[PDB]
Write a protein that binds this ligand. Sequence first.
Ligand SMILES: Nc1nc2c(ncn2[C@@H]2O[C@H](COP(=O)(O)OP(=O)(O)OP(=O)(O)O)[C@@H](O)[C@H]2O)c(=O)[nH]1
Ligand SMILES: Nc1nc2c(ncn2[C@@H]2O[C@H](COP(=O)(O)OP(=O)(O)O)[C@@H](O)[C@H]2O)c(=O)[nH]1
Ligand SMILES: COc1ccc(N(C)c2nc(Cl)nc3cccc(F)c23)cc1
Ligand SMILES: [Ca+2]
Ligand SMILES: [Cl-]
Ligand SMILES: [Mg+2]
Ligand SMILES: [Mg+2]
Lengths: 54, 346, 424, 437
Amino acid sequence: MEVIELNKCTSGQSFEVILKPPSDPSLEEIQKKLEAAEERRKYQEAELLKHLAE
Amino acid sequence: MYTFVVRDENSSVYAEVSRLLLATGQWKRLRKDNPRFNLMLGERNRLPFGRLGHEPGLVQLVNYYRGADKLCRKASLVKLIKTSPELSESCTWFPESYVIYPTNTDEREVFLAAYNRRREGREGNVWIAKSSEGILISSEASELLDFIDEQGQVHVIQKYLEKPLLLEPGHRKFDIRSWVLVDHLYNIYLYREGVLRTSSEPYNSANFQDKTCHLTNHCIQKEYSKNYGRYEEGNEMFFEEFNQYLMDALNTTLENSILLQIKHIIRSCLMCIEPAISTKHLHYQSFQLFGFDFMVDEELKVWLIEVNGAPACAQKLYAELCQGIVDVAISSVFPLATSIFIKLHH
Amino acid sequence: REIVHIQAGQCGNQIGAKFWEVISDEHGIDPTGSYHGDSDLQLERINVYYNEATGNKYVPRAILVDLEPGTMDSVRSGPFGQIFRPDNFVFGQSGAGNNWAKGHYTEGAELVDSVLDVVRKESESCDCLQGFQLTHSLGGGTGSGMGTLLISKIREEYPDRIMNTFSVMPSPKVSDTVVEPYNATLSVHQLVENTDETYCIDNEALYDICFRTLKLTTPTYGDLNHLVSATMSGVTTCLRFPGQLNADLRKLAVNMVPFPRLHFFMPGFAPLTSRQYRALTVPELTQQMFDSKNMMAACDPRHGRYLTVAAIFRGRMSMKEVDEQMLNVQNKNSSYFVEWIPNNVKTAVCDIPPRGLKMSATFIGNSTAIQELFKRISEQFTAMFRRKAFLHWYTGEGMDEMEFTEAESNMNDLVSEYQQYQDA
Amino acid sequence: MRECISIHVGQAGVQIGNACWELYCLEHGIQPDGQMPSDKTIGGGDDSFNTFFSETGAGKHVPRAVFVDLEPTVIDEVRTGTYRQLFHPEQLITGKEDAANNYARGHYTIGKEIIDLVLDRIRKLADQCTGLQGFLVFHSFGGGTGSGFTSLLMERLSVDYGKKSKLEFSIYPAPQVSTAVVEPYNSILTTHTTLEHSDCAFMVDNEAIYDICRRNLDIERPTYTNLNRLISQIVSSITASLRFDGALNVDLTEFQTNLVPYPRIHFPLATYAPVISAEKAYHEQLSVAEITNACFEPANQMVKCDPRHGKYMACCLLYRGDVVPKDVNAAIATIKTKRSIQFVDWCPTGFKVGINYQPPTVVPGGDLAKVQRAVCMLSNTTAIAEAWARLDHKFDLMYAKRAFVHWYVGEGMEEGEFSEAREDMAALEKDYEEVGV
Ligand SMILES: Nc1nc2c(ncn2[C@@H]2O[C@H](COP(=O)(O)OP(=O)(O)OP(=O)(O)O)[C@@H](O)[C@H]2O)c(=O)[nH]1
Ligand SMILES: Nc1nc2c(ncn2[C@@H]2O[C@H](COP(=O)(O)OP(=O)(O)O)[C@@H](O)[C@H]2O)c(=O)[nH]1
Ligand SMILES: COc1ccc(N(C)c2nc(Cl)nc3cccc(F)c23)cc1
Ligand SMILES: [Ca+2]
Ligand SMILES: [Cl-]
Ligand SMILES: [Mg+2]
Ligand SMILES: [Mg+2]
């Protein structure tokens, strides 16, 4: 069990203790997704308003 | 009023426990997937321990110890005994054993170092092989490993016990099944009744290809044995007869010659793993019924061979043992509106 | 945030007036609109239902609608009559004769544009209108026929707002005319399509409650409406009172309605009061609010399963005790709560109790047992419709038997869809 | 000195941010108006606390923080509360109507047109940074804002700040204090869409905080206020190394380096001890060995699970108070002998240790007692995957009936996103299983 990289200072100290060794989409595609969902939404709304107009 | 769910229908012991639970009028059964249960009699495989103890307003209790497989599958138990300081490689009640993987870590290069010292020292050199149907007891290794590699799973092979205690009349072998219940408090309870699963065929130390006088399984004996049931009904000698026999034939009690050792082994195994599996400070609780399998040699020395984690009982003893499970494991946690267990503590 | 309230027809306006009396009292407002309460919990969300007017006055965001002036006059003359803005009284003269067709197609159409004018005027003074609640019966003519006309118009003009209704169901035990089943079935067809959440207030249940347990031998509509205003104040308490759960109509829809069409809620109330001294204990409150005998929709909840439940405890009590009791109900009757919606029962607590009670509990269940209600209606419907009885009142307003057949089918489909999830 | 921007999203994120920033101000001696007398470099500096506070010419110390909610009522409480002066108005951003507990409403419908404003205010903070190292993002899994708007914000941050580190403090949903029946849907959805945009996430199960509050604080029925003062203690414990002199976890990159070897498995478990009631009359102060030992009781974890049946990939101990290395090493030795601590074969068995001698600051009048020493352990154990199992199971139950799905589809989301997110979580669960069995 050995103690390494002991660094220390007025606020405190730090160190490691070893016990045993080792055995994204772009802005383009994003605003395209947001707009696709807005299109599906606007379409469902149009279906609804057409049914109400019937 | 308490609720339980049954997720292993193929369990004789807990089928009976379900019946006794219902017959109290204070336990109702829910559907296998209804999570609002107090009690879970879980499946044997991939029981979902991570989903227990997250139901507000429900104290939850399961009939298995997550982790206990380390004791109850053969390679695991060998690994545990060799590596654990509490048991150590110098363990005096477990036979020399080694973990071997098929051709397709392993211990055959460490095996052979011992095997050949045993063949040179002109000692009895029978070894047995098995995993967790497909058994080979041989006198030379190249039969053992050859057989292991025809199958495809990890195997353990261990010093066969060449001088067993033989029941007379009959000159036959046997194993001793002990039933131990561990409760949510980690009390270890040994059931007062054990069973001797005997062979019906005199012990033939000659050719080890006949498994009828060397393996004591209740199945192989009903099917492939000559006189299944000649000496005892169902090839099962219970504890009173066996104690009588030891008194009459050998001038000792079962308690003295054998049980002391079985209690020592049971307690040692369970106390060893207690930190890895205890649910003392856990959000759910566990109990578990275990079947410890023992073999006595001709010098009245007890040996452990397998621990089984989902055992069946003997038909005579189902009632009493299942009622004991309810009393100590279940009603302890969920109370209702001269014990059959010996508590193991030292 | 803001809710716009519409009450239509005789029943709609009588229960609507009672609702505004009751919650006006709860929020400390007097019949003149002048706030005179003591606490400040009463005003934090006062704008959900009230508009602030000149001189620190509070004016209900309420539109009153009828085709005959009798009942609207009765409201103006009533106790809180002068709290409503007079421009929000919109009425005709001919009435609707208990005829869904007059309310929806002929007389109502003539009046609906001016109602929608007042609707629009109220809505444009709203910072963030969340939607509308309507009060109406389903068995008369104005409430059922014209209120459902209104609802589909409102949906057309505001298709992204919540539409919520308190809908009184007709019962032969409390019956005005024989054509009530016809009217109800035509209306339910409308409600299934155009509301997000409907409180099914069964007049059968209200009668049975007044009779069997309040020991009232001759229940009046006043006795029924006391139960209705208690239920209404209860189911809207999380809307108008600041709590941990900052609730609104849309969250309530999202959480209560797993499938769009199954949005017909069974309301319940405890303790059942008549127009006492013993304080209820939280275990008693909890056992009662779940009791078939305290629900306002005549159904047997054991005959179905709870999809979702929302419960509201009003009073000063132990939130710990409330949690334990609710969990005890679910854990001791888990058979009756669908297992495929985890944790489908949620609870809220308000410190302010209703008038005259130290503690109360309101229950809002979406149960598949609600099918029983619609089955009742459908049976009554079919009994007449197979002989085409009383249809002439409707064909004389332009309607075709085909439209009756369609609404019958849609209601029977609704019943089937509930049965689908009672066995899942 | 490199700056850190905190972003608080939705009700849970904002109320937790309130708690944490109150704590920070107490710890660094910053008053509610933003004045810190011990700061002699007036108008600026590159001290350690400056990674969280900027300075005005008038001596005001101002959190590097943005609060964003889709409805106004909760951030309005920040705007009128004790620390109103602390925050500059354009760092407090509100909508008109919330996401109605609906991930898709927060991500798509309402998200789409407050996102650019939020990113503009975030850029106004970053432009005040000589060397921004990245973001600490606070949000619930369950809220419609906290789930949906957060995942949109995370995607965009990866775009506009690709080299920067993003850390999550994430509230996992618990029925005892949950507000909505669809929190499993939202959880899975937001985890799948955020996984690749987050370098390290600290998950806090409200069930654990709730129970810790009941058992060790003797609070009958904990409120959000209880839970958040406790959560903020843990958060302060985690960030103390960015705000104070030291050599362990000094930048956001070091959290990934020390705690996350495999990038997908970036959910460290946090254990915190001791938690002691202020109303405890006589308290015997716990030793280094007792609190370090408590770090291995499940009842002290931020998420209830059993690390004994998992494997460790990393382990950090953060002490605050009267602690010296040799007492830590003694404690560790004895603990190693009495406990089931298995590391993965390709990782060293060991502990990175950090000590700050100032003991924990407690909110005056709060519930937590002052103590002479306390520790937070951060361990990357496979056992936390239990939480994903639980969550995934609840999801599978509802989705098999498509219950409530119509509420998401009607916001423009496609049914396939549900099974895609679930697909991903199946992958995650398998990653965990074969790293650790
Ligand atoms: N620990 C803690 N959890 C909270 C707090 N507030 C809300 N939650 C949890 O967060 C989940 C609900 O998410 P919220 O943040 O409240 O909702 P939101 O992000 O504001 O989204 P919407 O209200 O749907 O617009 C539930 O599981 C709550 O229990 C809080 O202050 N502290
Ligand atoms: N519960 C309740 N039901 C009512 C009330 N007034 C009428 N009803 C019921 O509503 C139906 C009559 O419809 P009504 O509202 O009078 O006709 P409308 O004015 O044309 O809408 C019948 O089922 C009545 O029993 C009331 O004050 N309370
Ligand atoms: C899972 O079932 C749920 C049901 C409802 C809700 N919310 C949005 C609520 N809304 C309203 Cl208006 N009143 C409520 C009253 C009591 C409990 C609640 F929770 C209420 C959340 C979840
Ligand atoms: Ca400075
Ligand atoms: Cl960058
Ligand atoms: Mg009438
Ligand atoms: Mg919110």
